[PDB]
Design a protein around this ligand. Sequence first.
Ligand SMILES: [Mg+2]
Ligand SMILES: [Mg+2]
Length: 161
Amino acid sequence: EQKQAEIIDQLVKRASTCKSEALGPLIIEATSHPSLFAFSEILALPNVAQLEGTTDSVYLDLLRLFAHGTWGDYKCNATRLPHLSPDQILKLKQLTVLTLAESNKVLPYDTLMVELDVSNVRELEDFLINECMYAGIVRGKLDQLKRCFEVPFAAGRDLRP
Ligand SMILES: [Mg+2]
Ligand SMILES: [Mg+2]
């Protein structure tokens, strides 16, 4: 954990040996993979960049989203992207927490709820503990009285060579 560096290795090796037709499926695989949170190195592959202009360009758009965007960016672009699976939705919400933690080491519950489309503090805390801390991508403290998440330790999305 990295575990991530290992999967990036396997994916880069496959992307640079497989037919270009296999790249869309590889992108769906990457964005569904339980241990993968950093997509920059994959996005930067010349193999992937060359999907632009092709029938699979929407999958490059999907990869760009997972590299750089938040759950909100997906909602904005949903009519021009494939529909996401539960695993992809979960991952984009986890990545959104990582983006927020990059900007601020104290995250108000109200901000988190808007960014993640979580309706209540229970659902929010459950997500932070049972999906984010569980995955090893953040370590911090929940302050129920102050309604905030103090997150000194968060995985970086722009983690790259
Ligand atoms: Mg990334
Ligand atoms: Mg960044």
